[PDB]
Amino acid sequence: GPYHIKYAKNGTHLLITGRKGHVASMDWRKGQLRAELFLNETCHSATYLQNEQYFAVAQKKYTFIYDHEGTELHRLKQHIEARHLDFLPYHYLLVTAGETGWLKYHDVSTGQLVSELRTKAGPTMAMAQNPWNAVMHLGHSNGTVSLWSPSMPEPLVKLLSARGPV
Amino acid sequence: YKLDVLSSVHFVPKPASTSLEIRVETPTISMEDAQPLYMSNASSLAPQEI
Amino acid sequence: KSDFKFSNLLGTVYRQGNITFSDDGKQLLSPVGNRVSVFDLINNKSFTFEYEHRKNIAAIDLNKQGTLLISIDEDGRAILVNFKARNVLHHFNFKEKCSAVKFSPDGRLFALASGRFLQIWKTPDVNKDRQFAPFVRHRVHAGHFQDITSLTWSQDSRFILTTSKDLSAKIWSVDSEEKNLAATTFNGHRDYVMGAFFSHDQEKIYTVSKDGAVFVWEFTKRKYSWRITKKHFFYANQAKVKCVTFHPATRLLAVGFTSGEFRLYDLPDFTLIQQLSMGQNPVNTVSVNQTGEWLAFGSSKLGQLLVYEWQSESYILKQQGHFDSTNSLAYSPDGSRVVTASEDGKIKVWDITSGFCLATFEEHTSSVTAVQFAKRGQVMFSSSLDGTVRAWDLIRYRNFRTFTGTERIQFNCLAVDPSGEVVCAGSLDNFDIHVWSVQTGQLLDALSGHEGPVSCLSFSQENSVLASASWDKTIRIWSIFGRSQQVEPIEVYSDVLALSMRPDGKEVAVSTLKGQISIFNIEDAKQVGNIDCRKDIISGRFNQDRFTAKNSERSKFFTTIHYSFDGMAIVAGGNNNSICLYDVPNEVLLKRFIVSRNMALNGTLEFLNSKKMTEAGSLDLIDDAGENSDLEDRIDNSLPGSQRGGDLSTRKMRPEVRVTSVQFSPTANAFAAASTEGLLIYSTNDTILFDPFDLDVDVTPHSTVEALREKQFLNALVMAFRLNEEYLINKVYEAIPIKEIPLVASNIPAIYLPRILKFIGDFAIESQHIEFNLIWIKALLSASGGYINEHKYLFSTAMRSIQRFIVRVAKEVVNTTTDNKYTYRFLVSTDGSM
Amino acid sequence: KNSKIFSPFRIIGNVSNGVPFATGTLGSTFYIVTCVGKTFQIYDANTLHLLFVSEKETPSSIVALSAHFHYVYAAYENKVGIYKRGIEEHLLELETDANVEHLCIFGDYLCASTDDNSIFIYKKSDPQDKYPSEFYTKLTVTEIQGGEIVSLQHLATYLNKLTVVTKSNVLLFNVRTGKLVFTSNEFPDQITTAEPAPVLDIIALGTVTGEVIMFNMRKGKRIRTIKIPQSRISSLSFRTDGSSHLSVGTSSGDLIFYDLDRRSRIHVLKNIHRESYGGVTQATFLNGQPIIVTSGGDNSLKEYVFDPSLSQGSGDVVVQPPRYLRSRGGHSQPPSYIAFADSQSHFMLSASKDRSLWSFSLRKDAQSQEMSQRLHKKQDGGRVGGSTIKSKFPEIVALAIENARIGEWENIITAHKDEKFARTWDMRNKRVGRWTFDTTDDGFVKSVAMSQCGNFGFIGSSNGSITIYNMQSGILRKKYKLHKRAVTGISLDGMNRKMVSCGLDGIVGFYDFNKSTLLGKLKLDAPITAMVYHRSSDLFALALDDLSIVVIDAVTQRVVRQLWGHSNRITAFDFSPEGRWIVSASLDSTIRTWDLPTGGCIDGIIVDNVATNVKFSPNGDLLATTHVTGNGICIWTNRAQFKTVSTRTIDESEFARMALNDIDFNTYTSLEQIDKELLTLSIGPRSKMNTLLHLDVIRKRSKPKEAPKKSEKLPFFLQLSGEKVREGIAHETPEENKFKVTGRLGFESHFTKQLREGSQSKDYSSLLATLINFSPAAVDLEIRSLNSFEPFDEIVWFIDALTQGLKSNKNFELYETFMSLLFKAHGDVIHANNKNQDIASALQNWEDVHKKEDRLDDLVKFCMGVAAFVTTA
RNA sequence: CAUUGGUGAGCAGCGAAGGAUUUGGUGGAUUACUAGCUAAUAGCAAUCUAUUUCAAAGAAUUCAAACUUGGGGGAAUGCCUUGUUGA
């Protein structure tokens, strides 16, 4: 432990990633285990891609894409020390942010880095997608929340919503 | 450096070469490390060298 | 005889934790890995406590009275120690990662930063007897939301300032009645609050953050509340604050940055007094003397320790140690100093008493494998894997000569002629032994005959033959000097790893891969003894091992062995957790010493806790670098397969406990062992043991004093030796009048002659009675000069100690006396005018 | 009765003495309080880990224990103590000589029942006070009211009613008003136990003839009756986990479980605790759990758990029988032999009359374990001969342990009572070994010893033969036959060369183990009862029959010390690790410490119970002793390890009635100067001379390579502006006229005043004292600051001061150093004015003294020339 | 003739209400024993949450922030930098 949990969009599968590197994908209702990885490493968060078949794990320095059975498919060398992972379902983009202060969008279908944006605010403290319009909200140590899209090198909006880190 | 570390320092020494070094006369205490003691008080140049 | 105790640890002055000055300011307490070392700078003496944590020390404190020392490891395990008696009073487990511990300036209470809680306990009375639960809790405070970085006591012991990773500093009152006086939280820092301090008047509170901001807090009108009246900033380009300390009386602020440079500031003005750099590695800890004059900094990466006298801009102390690097050690012929060879390529000369490095030599490019003195002692030789053997002159500290092979061979072992005219080196890739002439530097010849790499070499001091061993399962005795060149090979059952030569030069012992120490007669070339050692050796299971320690054959042999100068004992060590001392004539193990009890080292435990084992594997093997908050900690620079020869970051595996070299002290009953943590020095100096010789009922301490009163000095002295009590020998020794010393000296029995000479050598070196001790030596040598000659090896250590006293202290006195005499004559005699 | 070397530390091996334990809850967790003689211990119910012990021993044994949240109430004699975290918070002293028997705490009322049927009520002074302190009233139950009080219970939802249970019947008292609310109908059988049920108004009562009654206090009538013929109830407890179960403990050691709903017996646990020690003294279900904690007088505390039923339906019918979960324990009878297992003080081996061998841990109680007696299969292949009914090995009279070969093969030997062989054990596996050593002469084993190498085991028989076996293979190797009577001791030195033996015939044999030869034989006046050998010093002591301890040196085979003073048989004795002390216990209830160097008794103790065994820790920090009563081991702390102990002999006559300082403390301080004519260095570090001479060069090395950066706007007087301590020469203040170069009066330094004072008084002793004390920087500054202008008074005075110092012959190395600094700083001044009479005369007088101290050079040269020649040729 | 090759048939000897081999589960140890929860100078442990809000303090032109990249060659369109045009 501790364990970071992510449910699938349809709620049928559960993805748990332990900090010391225990990652398990299961159908919690039927009590069936799809995959179980004992990566001897520091894992921060995991997410499901378009369905339960593929999931991504943010490990010590690189993000890895895994299969339904747990076979490693890709090592995302471009995503460095990602601490948050999000997937935009209708756009097929995987979003990462971490200590580098860089927001990267990756197309899982084609496997091409759609865009990499410089946040210029140090490590990213929080991240959340707006399901209505797929705009990413990032919180920073300066207490500002910035709204981002892959097609703009600068934040769409900046909101001062705290006096310390968000 | 990297290749030596990788081979666990079982390398073959580089070919020997010659260089010239300049020695400045100074009290031998100065060459030592800094603490409340000294080993030798002689000079750093021999009488022949002076 | 075989009563050795751990005395001090050389080679390391700082590993991690916080270094504390004594209240008097005259002693510096520095954590050295698993133990605490105390350096007395004024008296130039040092000692390391015998007690030992199971992990590295994290926080230490010594109370103002100087009587109680509390040290805490990385798990929260604490040990309370009686500083004066050097004994452990109690062991306490706080069940958390205690970041800091501090005694109150009264001494009644001490506080603990254990996670997000501040724990205040009552100090046990040092005079009281040990009891089951000496500590009594006073209070536990839970206001912080994240781990406490540090804490500070007020000068009156009434308030505590704590700083946490919550970007906050908070104040507490030691007395519940005064809780309303101080219940404030200080906010506004962008990063972790590294330190918070009171002013001398205690009306101003300063807080410092990691980002590099200092805030001044005052109780003022906007009705009154704490406010930030002023804000100061360290405009460090990228360096972050790593440690901070404040001296209220002198208003001195010392800040250590991660870039390796520290600044001294004067508060509240924020005037930059000085700015220096100790290196490129972070300054992990900073401490201040009580007077405020000395500042002590420590860097963990290279193990540097630095005391800075900021007033005069001088260095009282400037030292750097070694971890996992020492490959060899060598005693000076007088035993005063010890030299070490390290994988860094640096040779360092350490003073045994002081505990500090006198000189450092950095000529070698690669690891230095061996070091050795000439019989004279003025000169030193060292071999290195860079392919060179270098001779060093200690009078002028110059590399006066360098020997090199024609075909670029790494050298792993070395040997020097007792005449100091021939030097021989061996290698693990050539199978030959190179020989050079010291005066000329030319390669005399290459001895051949081994079918395997040469593992070790040694010249005999008297007959001057050369004995070499190899992994070829054989030993060859070379008669290099003389008109005829002869080689006598001796076969051994297994690969020879170490070799030691008797001071007599008549026998040679070899440690093999089977775990055997076999002794051979050189002249007759036949075995005379054998010692089995596999069962004695303690080898621990590594965390990565998939096989038990019992079935493990990783190191059940000794890679280094040395004789005692009497010729009757062998001290052995290897890549294992035991230093075994054997008695040669009887082939028995006198005693075994455990090298380390640190679970941070890999080979310490024979059995590993099954709780750590899991379906994934051992929890220890999981790498948690990504958790670390600083990028430098997270970075992985490890080469995939390296085993040795690089920095610790390169290995990726835990350090393994091992002993690289062992030697006996030429001048004392002590031995030094180079290991991973440092140079362990075991000595018999304490001598609390009651070891009588030839007692009878009539012999008693009272009867000894009665003999002195009756003026029977010879009988009094002999009876003192039979009891073998130092205090009684000292009492009798100083009560003998000068007139009757020659009478007593001529009549001392030959059996007790080695004991008196040993006592004089130890007593004289630190005593003030220079003339009294010299009179005794003159009487003893004159009376029994012939006897000492007939038995050189029985009196060797005692004689060497006496010569050390005559040369290192007695000469220095007369040398200062005699130049005054000549300086006198010149001033009076010559003409001074105009 | 107070020792000057040792003090009690605690008692090991004790878990419960038989007093019913108390269960308290802190939050969700549970803890158990058990009584251990005059102290109690608190265990964590989840792990049975020791948490706290009472800080001090009570004056009298504890009779009752009750725990509520953090606070614990312990009753002893006529006093009730209140403890928190093992530390007494308040002591309640009752005003009657009657001893307390039972203890009940509900709300703010503390009820204590004395043996005279008097109930004392205490009340909280404040409603928010933690514990009751104030004395409220006293209620006494008379014989017409009821019989002897059996227990005090409080039922839930009762306002200020105390349910007093007596042998005759139950009584309901109102503590607030002190009036009898209700009296129960008389019961035919004597009530022995009472327990409030989890149901309202019902209390379970247990009689002396195996009857359990569910008495309803509200209705005043019986509700049920369980019958247990030919059994005596000792404990009762209800299950609160939603299953209507009732546990009945009996004095016979059996624990029965009933199902109240079904009217059936679930199971019976037979002989969980010994009948001979009181059976099941206490058995309590943990609140809301399937776990039941049981205790008895056999020094054991067990837990049992009810597993979930194996049936998917009808789980209430198919009830799994209770399963043992965990336990803690120790000896049931006093230990007979003890020993230290390792060089550290971690583990001890103990053997008791209960036929069990235990390994006890000083560091943590949970590590204590019982050594297994399961036998290894015979190597030959034949069937081992023994009774099918398994029984423990007989009592252990002697034990011998080594650690040179731990983990390789057997490393313990034990001797048993009236048994003709010795058994081996293995410390690493904690099990009996596979070898058995026989005397081979039809005699019982009286002595066991092991060689330090761990390869040999020596067995001494009652018929006088010493057999020697090999521990790895268990094969007899050698047999010595010198004694004709029983051999009561065997020992072998560290070198495995000289072996020593002693027997009841009174002779001491000295053998050569290597060559198997008789080195000598020594006969003592009286039979020898025991031996202890000190391997480091090669001294061994013999407890003789005439009430003496005789110390003998094995090397020379002569008695060196003989100790007298014991008035009865010496049960045991041991050597201190440093070989300097012997502590011996005798049957006259005294433990004496003897100082071998002086051969006198330095300390003495009087123990209530005779100490059977005495053992030092190899570290020397602890002393362990076992006594004729008590199941534990008494651990003492050696105060000699933290301060010096006087070796003055103890007063004998004073000790019976209860039933030169440097030499006394074993230290000597060197004289300041042995003789006036002898040259003596200064009493200080030897580096001071070298630092003073080479101060500048040492300091140039000290300076940093690069100049520190500093702020341009810096206070000029920052060093002086220090809020206030520094004692440097710079921080000197003047002490209270024409101008003078050296110093105007009222504004001159301390050093200059002393120099001027000395010149007039013709004595610079005061100034020389302060020169030696001055720091090296201060000394250089003062000499440099001396007046160097005509008439050169201060330079002349300084030379005179140093010349006087050389006459003393003390601190001469420093006076030489001060003179060298004078020439360094003012040599040109002296050279220019060498003809001046004042300077010349001062210099000449210095030379006359200085000329005498050349004898040191002659001694120094001689010693090297001979020492170099002696060591070389 | 030898098997220290396999598979069996039987003795001598050992031998107390049987003996041998294998195996699932749980418990205690595997570091040195100061008790549970919380919003913690005290409460709770049956929780309150029907006082849980106010007040005070708290915002660096650091308005800097990939120390984080396998090598060679490029980079239309992107992105970064610099200038420039019109508002």
Side-chain angles (χ1 to χ4, degrees), chain D residues 286-359:
Chain D
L286 291 187
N287 200 302
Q289 295 298 110
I291 304 169
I292 178 164
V293 186
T294 64
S295 182
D298 57 358
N299 195 15
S300 180
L301 189 147
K302 322 203 163 154
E303 301 196 358
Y304 295 86
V305 65
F306 287 76
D307 274 357
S309 173
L310 281 163
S311 65
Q312 315 175 326
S314 58
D316 63 58
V317 185
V318 186
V319 182
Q320 287 264 48
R323 203 190 61 275
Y324 163 89
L325 183 57
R326 62 179 68 86
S327 64
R328 288 289 188 277
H331 302 291
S332 299
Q333 316 184 10
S336 56
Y337 213 80
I338 51 160
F340 283 86
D342 45 355
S343 65
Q344 275 74 50
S345 298
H346 197 173
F347 276 100
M348 286 177 72
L349 282 185
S350 304
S352 169
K353 272 77 74 177
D354 64 1
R355 293 168 81 98
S356 71
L357 197 154
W358 267 84
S359 83

Side-chain angles (χ1 to χ4, degrees), chain C residues 612-834:
Chain C
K612 297 194 307 219
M613 180 45 58
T614 51
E615 65 277 14
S618 193
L619 301 203
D620 281 28
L621 288 189
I622 305 163
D623 55 332
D624 315 283
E627 285 295 17
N628 304 159
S629 57
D630 289 332
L631 170 55
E632 297 86 3
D633 299 331
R634 294 188 248 110
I635 282 160
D636 188 358
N637 274 127
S638 65
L639 281 298
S642 56
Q643 306 282 305
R644 314 281 320 121
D647 196 283
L648 291 155
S649 65
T650 58
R651 273 72 172 276
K652 175 192 141 303
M653 295 296 172
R654 224 171 279 263
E656 50 171 80
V657 58
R658 60 199 209 78
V659 186
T660 61
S661 180
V662 293
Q663 283 203 14
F664 272 101
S665 166
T667 186
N669 272 326
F671 68 83
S675 64
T676 48
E677 306 210 278
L679 271 73
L680 306 159
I681 292 165
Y682 293 76
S683 46
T684 72
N685 57 5
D686 55 358
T687 60
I688 68 184
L689 171 83
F690 177 53
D691 48 16
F693 177 87
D694 190 39
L695 288 170
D696 194 349
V697 296
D698 62 358
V699 187
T700 307
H702 182 238
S703 69
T704 312
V705 173
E706 163 163 326
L708 297 173
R709 275 198 300 86
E710 273 285 299
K711 302 292 187 288
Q712 292 295 72
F713 298 114
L714 183 68
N715 297 315
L717 187 64
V718 164
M719 281 186 328
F721 284 140
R722 294 170 73 187
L723 285 154
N724 212 47
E725 289 289 329
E726 289 140 1
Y727 85 104
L728 211 65
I729 292 154
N730 202 357
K731 175 154 182 104
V732 176
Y733 177 77
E734 297 184 358
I736 295 158
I738 298 284
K739 268 196 240 178
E740 187 174 0
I741 284 170
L743 179 50
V744 169
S746 73
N747 286 304
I748 282 157
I751 308 85
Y752 309 102
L753 182 60
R755 181 51 177 123
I756 182 71
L757 287 186
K758 178 181 208 329
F759 164 73
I760 294 179
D762 311 341
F763 177 65
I765 197 70
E766 60 86 20
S767 175
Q768 63 256 58
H769 305 117
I770 178 159
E771 178 158 359
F772 188 72
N773 301 335
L774 285 160
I775 286 165
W776 262 105
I777 292 157
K778 177 171 178 66
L780 281 183
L781 291 189
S782 74
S784 66
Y787 188 87
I788 299 160
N789 198 9
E790 293 158 11
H791 313 85
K792 292 183 178 181
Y793 307 98
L794 172 70
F795 293 83
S796 61
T797 62
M799 268 298 109
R800 205 88 46 89
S801 78
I802 291 188
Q803 295 166 230
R804 172 175 173 211
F805 155 65
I806 303 161
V807 166
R808 274 291 301 300
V809 294
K811 272 288 285 292
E812 295 205 320
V813 169
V814 299
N815 290 123
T816 307
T817 303
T818 189
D819 64 359
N820 285 358
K821 177 183 67 161
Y822 297 130
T823 304
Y824 175 83
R825 293 175 179 177
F826 169 82
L827 297 163
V828 300
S829 313
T830 57
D831 186 74
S833 47
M834 291 155 188

Side-chain angles (χ1 to χ4, degrees), chain D residues 537-549:
Chain D
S537 68
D538 277 352
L539 300 174
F540 57 103
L542 305 170
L544 271 64
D545 203 58
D546 59 356
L547 314 191
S548 295
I549 309 178

Side-chain angles (χ1 to χ4, degrees), chain D residues 26-27 29 49-50 52 70 85 130 325-326 328 346 362-367 369 377-378 383 385-386 388-389:
Chain D
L26 294 170
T29 65
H49 283 195
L50 186 60
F52 307 94
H70 292 258
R85 297 182 101 238
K130 294 289 171 181
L325 183 57
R326 62 179 68 86
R328 288 289 188 277
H346 197 173
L362 293 83
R363 282 188 204 177
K364 188 160 68 139
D365 272 29
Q367 294 170 335
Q369 204 191 277
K377 307 306 165 203
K378 186 189 291 141
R383 313 171 75 108
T388 59
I389 297 146

Side-chain angles (χ1 to χ4, degrees), chain C residues 265-495:
Chain C
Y265 277 96
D266 191 358
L267 295 173
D269 291 331
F270 203 71
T271 301
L272 177 78
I273 288 165
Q274 285 158 70
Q275 168 161 209
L276 290 82
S277 88
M278 62 193 315
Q280 287 69 240
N281 304 291
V283 184
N284 285 87
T285 178
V286 62
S287 175
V288 192
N289 206 289
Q290 186 60 254
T291 64
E293 285 146 327
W294 289 358
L295 299 172
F297 315 84
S299 196
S300 295
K301 175 89 83 160
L302 289 181
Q304 322 184 347
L305 178 50
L306 171 43
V307 171
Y308 189 50
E309 182 168 290
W310 58 283
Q311 281 289 56
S312 77
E313 302 181 354
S314 62
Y315 293 139
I316 309 312
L317 164 75
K318 203 200 154 71
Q319 305 294 332
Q320 161 162 343
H322 294 299
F323 187 49
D324 272 29
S325 297
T326 309
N327 281 324
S328 198
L329 62 83
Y331 268 102
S332 298
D334 55 39
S336 66
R337 292 188 297 272
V338 65
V339 175
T340 67
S342 296
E343 292 178 353
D344 291 331
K346 297 196 277 261
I347 298 143
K348 288 181 181 177
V349 184
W350 296 83
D351 185 65
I352 303 299
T353 68
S354 297
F356 304 129
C357 181
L358 295 154
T360 312
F361 311 115
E362 296 108 302
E363 293 285 0
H364 281 282
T365 77
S366 307
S367 174
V368 185
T369 59
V371 291
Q372 185 171 331
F373 281 83
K375 184 182 260 280
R376 45 171 141 180
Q378 294 179 356
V379 177
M380 192 199 327
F381 298 83
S382 60
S383 72
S384 171
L385 293 190
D386 63 358
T388 60
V389 168
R390 287 188 208 263
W392 307 86
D393 168 37
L394 292 197
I395 303 291
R396 313 212 189 252
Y397 304 129
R398 77 198 329 151
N399 180 48
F400 69 82
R401 193 159 276 123
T402 179
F403 315 86
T404 186
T406 59
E407 68 194 2
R408 313 321 293 121
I409 301 299
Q410 311 197 308
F411 298 116
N412 291 76
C413 59
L414 186 65
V416 188
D417 191 353
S419 79
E421 309 168 0
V422 176
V423 173
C424 303
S427 175
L428 291 202
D429 67 357
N430 191 179
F431 307 167
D432 304 274
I433 303 148
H434 300 258
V435 188
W436 297 275
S437 187
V438 177
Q439 283 94 40
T440 310
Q442 65 187 356
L443 193 60
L444 288 158
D445 59 357
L447 306 193
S448 295
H450 276 289
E451 311 156 318
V454 172
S455 181
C456 61
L457 291 163
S458 182
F459 282 97
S460 168
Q461 308 287 115
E462 293 82 3
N463 61 7
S464 199
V465 307
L466 174 68
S468 68
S470 162
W471 306 350
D472 193 10
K473 279 172 217 214
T474 187
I475 299 166
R476 304 170 72 86
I477 313 297
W478 312 79
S479 180
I480 57 170
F481 309 100
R483 226 178 291 270
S484 171
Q485 296 294 321
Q486 190 217 346
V487 191
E488 165 56 85
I490 307 106
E491 291 292 328
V492 183
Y493 308 102
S494 180
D495 302 333

Side-chain angles (χ1 to χ4, degrees), chain C residues 201-212:
Chain C
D201 60 356
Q202 192 166 356
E203 271 154 24
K204 291 177 71 68
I205 283 164
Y206 317 91
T207 57
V208 189
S209 58
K210 184 179 177 181
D211 54 53

